[PDB]
From Swiss-Prot:
It comes from Severe acute respiratory syndrome coronavirus (SARS-CoV). The chain holds residues 1884 to 1998 of 4382 of the full protein. Its cofactor is Zn(2+). This is Papain-like protease nsp3. Responsible for the cleavages located at the N-terminus of the replicase polyprotein. In addition, PL-PRO possesses a deubiquitinating/deISGylating activity and processes both 'Lys-48'- and 'Lys-63'-linked polyubiquitin chains from cellular substrates. Plays a role in host membrane rearrangement that leads to creation of cytoplasmic double-membrane vesicles (DMV) necessary for viral replication. Nsp3, nsp4 and nsp6 together are sufficient to form DMV. It comes from the Viruses.
Length: 116
């Protein structure tokens, strides 16, 4: 008896008019957060330092899940019960999981125009 059900995993979508800021993300695996901070063009000084943790470590502000749960349901990104999630493989990002990860970053963006 088993049902191979997800870890309460629910899609989402990016926020309207949201835009990147000077947040930085962090994680125990330096590469993971370094590769993510690369994708979105993070430039210091970093206004804040969020963290990521790999399941079942979910003490990071944002969390990660194993790529085996990446259904096309989650095409526009996903989240756990109430926290945002990403795909990780071997504690890293690869070209495979990079493309979907950019969507998570568009959810961590916040609604602030740069009309200056």
């Amino acid at each position: 008896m088993y049902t191979e059900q997800p870890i309460d995993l629910v899609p989402t979508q990016p926020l309207p008019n949201a835009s990147f800021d000077n947040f930085k993300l962090t994680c125990s695996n330096t590469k993971f957060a370094d590769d993510l901070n690369q994708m979105t063009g993070f430039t210091k000084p970093a206004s804040r330092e969020l963290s990521v943790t790999f399941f079942p470590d979910l003490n990071g502000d944002v969390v990660a899940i194993d790529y085996r749960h990446y259904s096309a349901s989650f095409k526009k990104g996903a989240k756990l019960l109430h926290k945002p999630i990403v795909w990780h493989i071997n504690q890293a990002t690869t070209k495979t999981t990079f493309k979907p990860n950019t969507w998570c970053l568009r959810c961590l963006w916040s609604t602030k125009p740069v009309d200056t």
